[PDB]
């Protein structure tokens, strides 16, 4: 009967995947420890971003209907470069209960990276209307109908920066890049010591055609903590259009190599998410007359 516990652990995977088709990755090492949350919260700080996600993921096998598990999983899985694999987790976090303002902000961001304007505005609105102090041409409705209630929320409570972050996200999705930067600048004035907004400042400068500004913000972000491969990807993108391809490729590869640092590196099914990052390697490495290398770019194993 040595198999007895392996059997049930296998069932827990598919028994919960059916109700939520999040592709829980096979070959996960935390799935047989007793207190994965306690070490996952520590792994998030001291060590690589990419191997705390598996611990938060293993929590959901032992414990469904725990909101913190999906909150953390959906947040960290998008601090890495897997956005499409984070949306479906925050949706379940909402399904547990809609009142959490810490989930709506992650939806507000994660949809702009895929141009889902309708979902972005829906979640951005409900974020504000969940708190008990905000009571009651891109689009002649549905847009200014939101921005006008944000302009009703700044004559009071002037200086909480998570509100300026929402204004930044709103102006980013409508291509107002030349005034999103100051919103994120004010936010960064008010709390300086977190990377999560330095990244969003740099990303707006990059789109405003100021790539010589962005690199400083990314070197703040990648100094508050390492392992934040989002900003490494953004640095590669900034170098590409500064025409320094020989350096852009070597930023890309230290992004791709760090994303998958675990023993028994990978299982299956999640790899479709990484297949969006190799295309920026190919796009640069198919300048500079590189023959016989775009073929491996098509499979694996780096350089």
């Amino acid at each position: 009967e040595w198999v007895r516990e392996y059997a049930e652990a296998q069932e827990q995977l598919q028994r919960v995947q059916n109700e939520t088709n999040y592709p829980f990755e096979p070959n996960n090492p935390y799935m047989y420890h007793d207190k994965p949350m306690e070490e996952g919260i520590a792994m998030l700080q001291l060590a690589n971003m990419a191997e705390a996600a598996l611990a938060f993921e293993a929590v959901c096998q032992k414990e469904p209907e725990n909101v913190e598990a999906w909150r953390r999983l959906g947040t960290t899985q998008a601090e890495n470069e897997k956005d499409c694999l984070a949306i479906i987790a925050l949706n379940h976090a909402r399904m547990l209960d809609p009142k959490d303002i810490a989930v709506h902000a992650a939806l507000a961001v994660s949809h702009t990276n895929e141009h889902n304007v309708g979902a972005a505005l829906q979640s951005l609105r409900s974020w504000l209307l969940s708190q008990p102090q905000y009571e009651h041409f891109a689009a002649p409705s549905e847009y200014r109908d939101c921005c006008t209630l944000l302009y009703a929320a700044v004559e009071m409570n002037p200086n909480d920066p998570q509100l300026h972050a929402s204004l930044g996200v709103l102006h980013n999705l409508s291509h107002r890049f030349d005034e999103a930067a100051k919103n994120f600048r004010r936010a960064v004035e008010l709390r300086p010591d977190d990377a999560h907004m330095w990244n969003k400042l740099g990303a707006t400068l990059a789109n405003g055609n100021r790539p010589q500004e962005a690199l400083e913000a990314y070197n703040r972000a990648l100094d508050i903590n390492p392992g934040y491969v989002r900003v490494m990807y953004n640095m590669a993108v900034s170098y590409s259009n500064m025409a320094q391809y020989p350096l852009a490729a070597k930023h890309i590869t230290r992004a791709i190599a760090l994303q998958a640092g675990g023993t028994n590196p990978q299982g299956e099914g999640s790899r479709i998410a990484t297949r969006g990052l190799w295309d920026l390697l190919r796009m640069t490495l198919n300048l500079m007359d590189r023959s016989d290398l775009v073929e491996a770019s098509w499979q694996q194993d780096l350089t």
Partner: protein, 316 residues
Amino acid sequence: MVNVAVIGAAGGIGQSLSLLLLRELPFGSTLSLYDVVGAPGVAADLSHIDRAGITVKHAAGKLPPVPRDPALTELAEGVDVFVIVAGVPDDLFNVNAGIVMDLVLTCASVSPNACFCIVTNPVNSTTPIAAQTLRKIGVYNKNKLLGVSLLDGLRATRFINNARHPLVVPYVPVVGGHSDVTIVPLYSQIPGPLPDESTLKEIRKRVQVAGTEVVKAKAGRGSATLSMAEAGARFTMHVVKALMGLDTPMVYAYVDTDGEHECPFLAMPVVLGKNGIERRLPIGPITTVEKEMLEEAVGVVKKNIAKGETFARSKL
């Protein structure tokens, strides 16, 4: 028979282009129309015409834009030519590039062998983007991707004709790119006596600033839409006739040079046939002034190719 699809048919350019295509297409052919808003009304309007032998078809897109729209995945079955004309009515490039990538990705996945005609501006940058998108899924064919630049040829012919009147030529060669400084009219290659240099360079300058002339007249509220529709329909009819075997014309288009010029993309004369481009022709002799103009134009064209082929969006 042929099946021709217009992607973005309810816009200002799109419905005039569709009206012109309806009355010119050969007997026994299909016309397909797509847009995210207004397609059903345009399809109902056009189907009341008494054109015999023509069947009109349509598909309505998702009201809030959605990538890989299922409606466009079903209208794209069996199509022979795709006319891509959707666009916003570097801020313009940043959005038109993203529109074009998804449109071509959705269309090319179900009918890989079709011809693609790019009308969305700026063509100098949006033709390389389509080439890269087709390379990514492994179905790129260099003989079936075309950029439309007939409008400046029409302008050049019109401007030279009413200076030498009565002396009429049917066309004028134009090479280089498709915007302002990058377009070079070769007036030395047309028959008959020619004006003096001071007048001729004034005529040459007007051709490449003609886009601003229309917008200034409209008080900045719009651009030229009838001329673009005329040029697009005229270019599309050549491709349709050449595919069927009823002609083999010579045209000037923004195409891949296939190693015959140092610039990866350029406007050049070509011969069309039953399976795309059949022959690429050299530019031919030119004078020193025109040689200097071409030297100036190619440097900007290369900078535009680089901007097109390195496009990527930054993850917030």
